[PDB]
Structure 1
Amino acid sequence: PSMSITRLFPALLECFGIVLCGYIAGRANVITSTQAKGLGNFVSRFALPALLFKNMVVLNFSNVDWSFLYSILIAKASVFFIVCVLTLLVASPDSRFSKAGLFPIFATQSNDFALGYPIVEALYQTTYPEYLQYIYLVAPISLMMLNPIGFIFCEIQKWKDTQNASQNKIKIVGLGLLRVLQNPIVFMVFIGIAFNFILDRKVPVYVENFLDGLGNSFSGSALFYLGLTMVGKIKRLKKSAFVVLILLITAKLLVLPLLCREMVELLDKGDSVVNHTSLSNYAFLYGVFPVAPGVAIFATQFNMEVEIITSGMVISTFVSAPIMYVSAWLLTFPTMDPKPLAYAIQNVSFDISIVSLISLIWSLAILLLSKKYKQLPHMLTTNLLIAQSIVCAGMMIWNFVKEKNFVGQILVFVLLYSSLYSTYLWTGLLAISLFLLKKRERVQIPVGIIIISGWGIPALLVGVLLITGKHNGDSIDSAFFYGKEQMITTAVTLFCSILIAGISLMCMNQQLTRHVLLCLLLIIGLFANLSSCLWWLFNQEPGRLYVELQFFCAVFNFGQGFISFGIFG
């Protein structure tokens, strides 16, 4: 295929597993905040410049598609210009230049080497090997292009804050540019380009082992340091600052991908449809890379906007994981016929259910071992997390069982289906329990009946499904394993929970917020699945928007554990 999309989930597990290792290590103080700087110094002063130098010396410039460079750079320059001019118009006077510097750098500078390259490598190393070159071209040329302008605005702020020092523009410009030249990425690219020419792309045999040994250590070491620098970083922001952060992460993780993709489709006027397509898709995925950790370092160096930039970098890194996974698969679906596409959505479901189950077990354990599960609603909320866990656990088994045998398929189907419906009801059961708790303190909530229904009724619905329906189990999609009746069952379950929740939340309006938020964020997913099921039935020959909806309702179905992991973890 045009992109080895199956290799992305392992790459993301490498990337974000090692970031999680660093995060766990810093949390557990396996490495303290002052000890982490030793790893950071190694990463940035040795491993990264070695990696840059090696790849820049090796690079065949007579094989670079400059259109991709110009496309991504013009897209980054666009987002930079937009965020800069918009920041200059929106922000308040005494902070507008610090923000106009760092917010555009934020919105454009990608976590290219640590996170981007493992992902690009996995996706494209075998299908389109030259796509790995553009990491080392785009990322540094991006700094040389755009970072000096942002630093110039930060130097304007440093100048303006220092009202004793109404000094020269030449110093402002020069110092901004000097900070760009002092960046190891920038100067090791200049140095590597010089030795690309001097050596005719040949790393000396007796220097190669060194550059290999240092450079190859970068990814793991940098991803680990990234985890360590994410510990204790998401400070409680003002509502205004949180909205700004959402808009900046939207610029980096949505707008920049869309503009990158558009620019490749504008400028890659070359002939090949499939090469144009894969390059376009690579441009989108390039745009989805997180904010580079270096932006937080610049912010610290200036002492400017540091909470927003650090928190945004942290959140951007984590938000890039699902967006990147989701986007890459979504872009790949137009290349797939309906059977490998059904396989694809089950693979997606399995992948998400793994990491969601892990998030769920963690969140469950926290709520249990904190003894939060004693309180109401938190006991039923823990049951909602239990419900989500059994959903994810079932889907993992269906991937193992999809070709095993008829009986195991049915049994595994019982489990997955039933937990699937149990989540649906616990959405509603929680929501009406919120109303019941809100109604008056003298009301004793019918916890036992609620639990018995929250698992009996889903078991009953799967029993009904087995009885009234028939085995459609030749079908790869487990949500279609029992066909028309299955999706009607799904639809009724969701609608019941939706009515229960809407009515109860209404009466409740006429601890609480996190559970209301949970129910609503589940309800948008329940409606995604409700839509999916009636649409399935009738469409009969569903379009591209259906496989994308099928995909996003699968992302919800199994990724809803991450919702719980955010709300209570």
Structure 2
Amino acid sequence: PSMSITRLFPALLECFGIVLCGYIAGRANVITSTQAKGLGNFVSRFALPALLFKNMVVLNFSNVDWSFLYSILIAKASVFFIVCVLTLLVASPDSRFSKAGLFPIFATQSNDFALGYPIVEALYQTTYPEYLQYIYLVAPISLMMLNPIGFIFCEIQKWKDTQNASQNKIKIVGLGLLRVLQNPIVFMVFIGIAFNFILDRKVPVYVENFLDGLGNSFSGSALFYLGLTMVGKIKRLKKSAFVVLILLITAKLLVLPLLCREMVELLDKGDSVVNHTSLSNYAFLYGVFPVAPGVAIFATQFNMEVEIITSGMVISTFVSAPIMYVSAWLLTFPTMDPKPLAYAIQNVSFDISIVSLISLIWSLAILLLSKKYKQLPHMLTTNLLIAQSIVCAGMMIWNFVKEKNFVGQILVFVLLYSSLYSTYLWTGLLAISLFLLKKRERVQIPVGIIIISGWGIPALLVGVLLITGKHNGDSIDSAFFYGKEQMITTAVTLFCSILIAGISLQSCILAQEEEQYLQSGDQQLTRHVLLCLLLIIGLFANLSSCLWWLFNQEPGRLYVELQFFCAVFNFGQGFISFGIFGLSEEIKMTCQQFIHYHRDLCIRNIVKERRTFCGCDLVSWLIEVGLASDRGEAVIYGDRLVQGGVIQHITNEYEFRDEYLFYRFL
């Protein structure tokens, strides 16, 4: 009925595929950091103002439900107040106010013009068209209400830092209000209100096409720019910063949706209980939008807490999508029957499985063409991705052979759950390999023994399940294909894997040292330990669901959520693996420019005699001088120099890269 949910997955695919395209373009150095400024300016100064003005001139303010806006504003104000009070009472006095100026803003301001609006449009287009108008009502008002307090706190921190006690509160409040008044959203909305009243809710035909043309290009360009602005933002941090970031993202993505739902339940007291449920669900879905990059822009402008804010915004952007999908499906579940419920679970798992299969075959092609799996622990990772691809393919076959052929059904079930148990066990084997590498022991690794164990133990478990179990062809879900025996063998396999994971966790000298450094750096322990920390979340979810079903024989109103979560993890675990292990005239001009003018003073610190400069030191020196903005521009400049015959590698085998590679002048 309401909240058509089958249209949400393509909308999420749009929203995050454009972001992924932007990230890939930025990271492959197609677009550098300087060239992204043009796209950012076009999006912020011409497309968003046009979209806001066009949508705000026609709003019909006499037919707007203000209860929803009041509830959302009350929830946001409550979250802001709580975060500000806790930050003031907890943070150290040296940089207290700055935190209280930005942490509440981080946990309240969301990204709903670029990401939230397509989702809301897809969910509520033909069912509740009046909901799409609320976004343009809620996003600006919040900036009109909560941003000034944060800006005032930041100005107070700046005043303390400068120690200019002669200032008064009037100037601080004036600066705080002026910073929020100059935002294009605020005054564009004000002008939209003014022209809405002047023009009697009608857009002249002369400017309709112009406004539509500028407004239709906002969403995709903003998604691309958001993807571009995440190329190098996530960096290593400390434990305290990590805990603060986890708390902030939990406040943004968990506490706020629940508070919005509670406020909508309290304030709204209308008839048509169906509409009340729809409004509460809409509030919950609105609460889960990620943090807007405008907060990072504010932090950069104030030059305070920029790194933690940027990292948190980037992380929350990616964390929000599974939360959105699962929350929407869970809220749609109550208005369903058990057989359509199972069909919906099958369909969602099939969609996740097919997208994950495409991503996994792409990642496998990359890994095979890299030809780096011959040394540990890349081949175990290759086996893990192979098992994930096989389980995705097995489920896609199962969705069609569920009630088509018998022998095909048994064969598909065997393949699918052998692959599932293979992934479960391979998590533990990878953890064991990482722990063994941690011991730094120069002992041979039984690669053959571990691989045959990992690919034969699940086969033996499936065989004994077939021998001792009872077939049940009336079950739509493959989890209950046999029943008690399948459940107990899955539970014991998960328990063993989790226990294993927990227990486990002209210069020859220059050439030899650089190849030794390359060999040492090829062992990417960070990514492997990240994967062998992330998989146990889903392993724990699976084990908890199995134990809950075993202990609670009578099905309560919690096993459906566990089924959905475990299926989503089981058939989307390949996304994590893809995210980890898946990613002339001007030449002459720059050549003579470098040779003639500033060639001198270059060889003073970065070049020394060796029995002749690195790759990182030259990039750092170029950044220091001012010939580049980031590492990308330095890499492009070095490529320009090398292609022109200015410098060359010693071995004549590597191009200009930001590694520990040595080059010589010509």
Q: Same fold by TM-score, threshold 0.5 exceeded?
A: yes
Deviation of 1:218 after TM superposition, in Å, equals 0.9
Q: Which moved more, 1:113-122 or 1:454-463?
A: 454-463
Indicate the RMSD between aligned Cα atoms, in angstroms: 2.9
Cα distance in 1 for residues equivalent to 2:283 and 2:333:
17
- After TM superposition, the structure 1 stretch with the greater mean CA deviation from structure 2, 221-230 or 357-366, is 357-366
Change (3 A) 1:409 1:563: same
Judged with a 3 Å threshold, the aligned counterparts in structure 2 of structure 1 residues 358 and 254 are, in CA distance, closer, same or farther, namely farther
Change (3 A) 1:478 1:68: same
Q: Distance in 2 between matches of 1:281 and 1:260?
A: 10
Equivalent position to 1:566, from 573, 576, 579: 579
SS of the equivalent of 2:202 reads coil
**Relative to structure 1, is the Cα distance of residues 97 and 400 closer, same or farther in structure 2, using a 3 angstrom cutoff?**
farther
Q: Kindly state the Cα deviation for residue 452 of structure 1 after the two structures are TM-superposed.
A: 1.9
Mapped contact 2:22–2:225 kept (Cα < 8 A)? yes
The residue number in structure 1 matching 2:149 is 149
Going from structure 1 to structure 2, the CA distance change for 1:403 and 1:149 (only over 3 Å counts) comes to: farther
Partners in 2 of 1:156 and 1:365 — Cα distance? 55
* 1:7 to partner: Cα distance: 1.2
Q: Which moved more, 1:489-498 or 1:27-36?
A: 489-498
Report the Cα distance in structure 2 between the residues aligned to 1:404 and 1:114, rounded to whole angstroms.
44
State the partner residue of 2:134.
Answer: 134
Q: Contact 1:356/1:558 (CA < 8 Å) preserved in 2?
A: yes
Say whether the 8 Å CA contact 2:377–2:523 is kept in structure 1: no
Residues 437 and 237 (structure 1), Cα distance of their counterparts in 2 relative to 1, 3 Å cut = closer
Q: Separation in 2 of the partners of 1:362 and 1:97? A: 47
1:565 to partner: Cα distance: 4.5
How far apart in 1 are the matches of 2:499 and 2:74? Answer: 49
SS at match of 2:235: coil
Deviation at 1:382, TM superposition (A): 3.3
- Give the Cα separation in 2 of the matches to 1:534 and 1:93: 47
Decide which moves more: 138-147 or 76-85. 76-85
Q: As a proportion of its length, which structure holds more helix?
A: 1
User: What is the distance in 1 between the residues matched to 2:154 and 2:552?
Assistant: 55
Moved more, 446-455 or 513-522: 513-522
For 1:510 and 1:289, the matched residues in 2 are separated by 37
The CA distance in 2 between the partners of 1:140 and 1:99, in whole Å, is 23
Q: Is the 8 A contact 1:437 1:445 kept in 2?
A: no
- CA distance in structure 2 between the partners assigned to 1:282 and 1:230 by the alignment: 29
Answer whether contact 1:436 1:443 (CA < 8 A) is retained. Answer: no
Contact 1:350 1:395 in 2 (8 A): yes
CA 1:354–1:150 in 2, change beyond 3 Å: closer, same or farther? farther
**Aligned counterparts of 1:101 and 1:440: Cα–Cα separation in 2:** 46
Structure 1 residue 235: Cα displacement: 2.6
Identity of aligned residues (%): 100
Alignment partners' CA distance in 2, 1:565 and 1:165: 54
CA offset digits 1:100-146 (Å, max 9, x no partner): 11111111111010000000001111111111111001100011011
Distance 1:369 1:255 in 2: 45
- Please list the CA deviations of residues 3-45 of structure 1 after superposition, one character each: whole Å capped at 9, or x if unmatched: 1111111111111111111111111122211111111111111
Q: 2:535 aligns with which of 501, 511, 522?
A: 522
Greater mean deviation of Cα atoms: 394-403 or 477-486:
394-403
TM-score under structure 1 length normalisation: 0.92
Q: Deviations over 1:407-448 (max 9, x none)?
A: 554444333222111111212333344455566735433221
Aligned in 2, Cα 1:56/1:407: closer, same or farther, shift over 3 Å? farther
Is the Cα–Cα contact under 8 Å of residues 15 and 223 in structure 1 kept in the other structure?
yes
CA deviation digits over 1:172-193, x for unaligned, max 9? Answer: 1112111211111111111111
Stretch deviating more after TM superposition (262-271 or 441-450): 441-450
Deviations 1:338-360 (CA, angstroms, capped at 9, x unpaired): 11211222233233334544554
**What is the alpha-carbon distance in structure 1 between the residues aligned to residue 467 and residue 325 of structure 2?**
38
The separation in 1 between residues aligned to 2:28 and 2:439, in whole angstroms, is 42
Q: 1:442 to 1:297 in 2, by over 3 A?
A: closer
Aligned partner of 2:632 in structure 1 is none
1:476 to partner: Cα distance: 2.8
Tell me: CA distance 1:61–1:525, structure 2 relative to 1, closer, same or farther (3 Å). Answer: same
| TM-score in terms of structure 2 length | 0.79
What's the CA shift string for 1:69-91, capped at 9, x where partnerless?
01111111111111111112222
Other structure's SS at 1:230 match: coil
Pick closer, same or farther for the CA change 1:151–1:396 going to 2, 3 Å.
farther
The alpha-carbon distance between structure 1 residues 503 and 221, as it changes in their structure 2 partners (threshold 3 A), is closer
Q: Distance in 2 between matches of 1:33 and 1:438?
A: 38
Deviation per CA, 1:511-554, whole angstroms, max 9, x where unpaired?
A: 66765664454344334323433544564542221111112212
Return the offset for 1:293: 1.4
> SS at 1:311's partner residue?
helix
- Aligned length, in residue pairs: 566
Tell me how far 1:257 sits from its aligned partner: 0.9
- Partner in structure 1 of residue 246 of structure 2: 246
Q: Which moved more, 1:427-436 or 1:71-80?
A: 427-436
**CA distance in 2: counterparts of 1:283 and 1:84, whole angstroms:** 23
Greater displacement, 18-27 / 55-64: 55-64
Alignment match, 2:599: none
Whole-angstrom CA distance in 1 between matches of 2:143 and 2:403: 50
**For 1:290-439, what aligned pairs fall within 5 Å after superposition?**
290-357=290-357, 360-361=360-361, 364=364, 373-399=373-399, 401-402=401-402, 406=406, 408-434=408-434, 436-437=436-437
Q: Which has the higher contact order (CA 8 A, sep 6+)?
A: 1
Could you tell me whether the CA contact under 8 Å between 1:159 and 1:165 is conserved in 2?
A: yes
1:453-488, CA deviations, whole angstroms, 9 ceiling, x for partnerless residues?
Answer: 322332343344445445534433232344443323
Q: Quickly say closer, same or farther: Cα 1:503–1:47, change in 2 above 3 A.
A: closer
Return closer, same or farther for 1:118/1:85 CA change in 2, 3 Å cut-off.
Answer: same
Using the TM superposition, give the Cα deviation of residue 245 of structure 1 relative to its aligned residue in structure 2, in angstroms.
1.5
Deviates more, 1:537-546 or 1:47-56: 537-546
1:7-406 equivalence runs, <5 A: 7-164=7-164, 166-357=166-357, 360-361=360-361, 364=364, 373-399=373-399, 401-402=401-402, 406=406
